[PDB]
Enzyme design. Structure first.
Site, PDB file in Angstrom:
ATOM      1  N   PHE A 197       0.952  -1.206  -0.020  1.00  0.00           N
ATOM      2  CA  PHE A 197       0.057   0.033  -0.160  1.00  0.00           C
ATOM      3  C   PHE A 197       0.887   1.315   0.061  1.00  0.00           C
ATOM      4  CE2 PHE A 197       0.703  -0.486   4.625  1.00  0.00           C
ATOM      5  CZ  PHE A 197       1.008   0.481   5.094  1.00  0.00           C
TER       6      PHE A 197
ATOM      7  N   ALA B 270       3.474   8.951   4.716  1.00  0.00           N
ATOM      8  CA  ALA B 270       3.672   9.233   6.189  1.00  0.00           C
ATOM      9  C   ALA B 270       5.142   9.563   6.493  1.00  0.00           C
ATOM     10  CB  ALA B 270       3.253   7.818   7.013  1.00  0.00           C
TER      11      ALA B 270
ATOM     12  N   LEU C 162      10.530  14.014   1.502  1.00  0.00           N
ATOM     13  CA  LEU C 162       9.372  13.632   1.737  1.00  0.00           C
ATOM     14  C   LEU C 162       8.369  13.509   0.655  1.00  0.00           C
ATOM     15  CD1 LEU C 162       9.379  15.498   5.259  1.00  0.00           C
ATOM     16  CD2 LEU C 162       9.517  13.133   4.746  1.00  0.00           C
ATOM     17  N   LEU C 163       8.002  12.609  -0.208  1.00  0.00           N
ATOM     18  CA  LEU C 163       7.140  12.568  -1.338  1.00  0.00           C
ATOM     19  C   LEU C 163       5.783  12.944  -0.905  1.00  0.00           C
ATOM     20  CD1 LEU C 163       8.685   9.529  -3.194  1.00  0.00           C
ATOM     21  CD2 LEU C 163       9.365  11.809  -3.256  1.00  0.00           C
TER      22      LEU C 163
ATOM     23  N   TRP D  49       6.619   6.145  -7.634  1.00  0.00           N
ATOM     24  CA  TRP D  49       7.892   5.753  -7.303  1.00  0.00           C
ATOM     25  C   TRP D  49       7.784   4.086  -6.832  1.00  0.00           C
ATOM     26  CZ3 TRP D  49       9.944   3.323  -2.605  1.00  0.00           C
ATOM     27  CH2 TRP D  49      11.311   3.149  -2.549  1.00  0.00           C
TER      28      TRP D  49
ATOM     29  N   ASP E  41      -1.970  -2.192   8.137  1.00  0.00           N
ATOM     30  CA  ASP E  41      -2.583  -2.117   6.670  1.00  0.00           C
ATOM     31  C   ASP E  41      -3.856  -1.155   6.578  1.00  0.00           C
ATOM     32  OD1 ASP E  41      -3.263  -2.285   3.956  1.00  0.00           O
ATOM     33  OD2 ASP E  41      -3.515  -4.427   4.063  1.00  0.00           O
TER      34      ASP E  41
END
Length: 317
Positions: free
Chosen positions: A134, A138, A154-155, A163, A222
């Site tokens: 997933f 965060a 920090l994407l 990515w 999850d």
């Protein structure tokens, strides 16, 4: 596990260990009616890359072996992936994560004890692989307080998803399917993420009909699993279908307030595997949890704390 250009003669070091393979109840609810029920064996994998005395990145993956008489349903679940960012990157993260995750997917040297009939088990040679990931941005999946570090990238959600798709596509070449779902996004929104990936399609890898709890694995920590828990505790497990589960998943706070929270699954069917001993460090589950608990107490913005954490681990070995 990693190429020489990366490790560079001891510039970089790895932490890698597995738990001893452990029988658990199936993460997919099997009715007691269903005879031919599989035994389920879970292995935790923890990997970290070290640069000198600092942690660079880490990856936690759980492997589930649904052992039937003639085949294994093998689920590979990416639990956590994270970076520290105390020093300027000298390696593209993906070019470590990709190969490590591929190694873990393909690892087949587990020492599985015999199931107590009310010195090691031999697994069937036929394996069906399931890779489950997933994507949710965060700031600190593994390394507390690292979100403030100068070189931590920090994407956002869309960038993180792109990515992950590129990594997963590169280590699932030739697999039977590659599925993407972005709960609450429309078909055209989801399809732009995979328009350049000819083997990818929208949807999920699990059984399409029937009750959700008998189709969808419940993995720890999850976003998908958090809703499955609620369906089970509220005793809606008898009614909720797979399709209704994914419809309602779109409205959960974690998704509908989230940043492009996405679900990836890939399958490869009917793979002939040869079981090969590959000596790696194995630990009890308590030892594993002990390590993870020490990890969550480290200030990863503090080189001193990170460097002692690492030296203390080097002492443990």
């Amino acid at each position: 596990m990693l190429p020489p250009d990366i490790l560079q003669n001891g510039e970089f070091e790895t932490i890698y260990f597995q738990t001893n393979p452990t029988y658990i109840k199936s993460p997919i609810h099997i009715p007691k009616s269903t005879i031919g029920k599989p035994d389920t064996v879970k292995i935790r994998h923890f990997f970290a890359l070290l640069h000198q005395d600092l942690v660079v990145l880490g990856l936690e993956v759980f492997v589930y072996l649904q052992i039937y008489s003639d085949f294994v349903e093998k689920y590979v679940y990416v639990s956590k992936c994270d970076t520290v960012g105390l020093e300027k990157s000298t390696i593209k993260i993906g070019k470590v994560i990709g190969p490590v995750l591929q190694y873990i997917i393909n690892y087949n040297g587990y020492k599985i004890k015999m199931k107590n009939l009310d010195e090691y088990r031999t697994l069937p040679k036929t394996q069906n692989l399931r890779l489950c990931v997933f994507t949710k941005p965060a700031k600190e999946y593994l390394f507390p307080n690292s979100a403030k570090n100068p070189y931590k990238a920090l994407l956002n959600g869309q960038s993180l998803l792109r990515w992950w798709i590129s990594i997963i596509d590169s280590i699932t070449k030739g697999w039977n399917n590659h599925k993407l779902m972005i709960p609450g996004a429309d078909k055209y929104a989801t399809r732009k993420f995979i328009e350049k990936y000819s083997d990818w399609s929208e949807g999920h890898i699990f059984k399409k009909d029937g009750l959700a709890v008998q189709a969808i694995p419940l993995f720890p920590d999850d976003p998908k699993g958090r809703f499955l828990e609620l369906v089970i505790v509220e005793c809606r497990y008898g009614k909720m279908t797979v399709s209704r589960f994914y419809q309602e998943l779109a409205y959960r706070q974690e998704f509908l307030l989230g940043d492009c929270v996405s679900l990836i699954g890939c399958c490869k069917e009917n793979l002939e595997v040869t079981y090969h001993d590959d000596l790696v460090s194995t630990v009890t589950i308590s030892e594993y949890k002990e390590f993870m608990n020490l990890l969550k107490l480290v200030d990863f913005s503090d080189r001193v704390e990170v460097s002692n954490f690492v030296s203390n681990y080097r002492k443990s070995k």
